[PDB]
Amino acid sequence: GSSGSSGNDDIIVNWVNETLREAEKSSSISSFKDPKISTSLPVLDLIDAIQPGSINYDLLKTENLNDDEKLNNAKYAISMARKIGARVYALPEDLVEVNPKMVMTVFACLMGKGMKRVSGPSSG
């Protein structure tokens, strides 16, 4: 749930964690500059957590990845985004190096659901 202050930019991380927690995922992040992101674990699981059936670990690697594999993972993650409707403008090449320069549109776009507004003072 959006328990807290729905709006801040720090929620971009909390959400990712929660969303995965409620989904019972083994992926997560610590900050916009998280290492695990290199494997696209938190970025891949985050999507599935919302729409089960898209991400198929079967095709994924998530095992001793490398400059080569790591990439394929980045390209796949972004691919799904658009599939579900996450028109993003970034490159999987920079994502492999946990670069917040391109990821700025990665998570942000996904967080598009978080930020919101209501008429009455409702918490959630």
UniProtKB/Swiss-Prot annotation:
Phosphorylated on a serine residue in response to costimulation through TCR/CD3 and CD2 or CD28. Serine phosphorylation promotes association with the actin cytoskeleton and targeting to peripheral cell projections. Detected in intestinal microvilli, hair cell stereocilia, and fibroblast filopodia, in spleen and other lymph node-containing organs. Expressed in peripheral blood T-lymphocytes, neutrophils, monocytes, B-lymphocytes, and myeloid cells. It is found in: Cytoplasm, Cytoskeleton; Cell junction; Cell projection; Cell projection, Ruffle membrane. The modification N6-acetyllysine is found at K33, K70. Residues 8-115 form the Calponin-homology (CH) domain. It is linked to Chromosomal aberrations involving LCP1 is a cause of B-cell non-Hodgkin lymphomas (B-cell NHL). Translocation t(3;13)(q27;q14), with BCL6. Defects in LCP1 has been found in a patient with isolated coloboma, a defect of the eye characterized by the absence of ocular structures due to abnormal morphogenesis of the optic cup and stalk, and the fusion of the fetal fissure (optic fissure). Isolated colobomas may be associated with an abnormally small eye (microphthalmia) or small cornea. Actin-binding protein. Plays a role in the activation of T-cells in response to costimulation through TCR/CD3 and CD2 or CD28. Modulates the cell surface expression of IL2RA/CD25 and CD69. Monomer. Interacts with AIF1. Interacts with actin. This is Plastin-2. It comes from Homo sapiens (Human). The lineage of its organism: Eukaryota, Metazoa, Chordata, Craniata, Vertebrata. The chain holds residues 517 to 627 of 627 of the full protein.
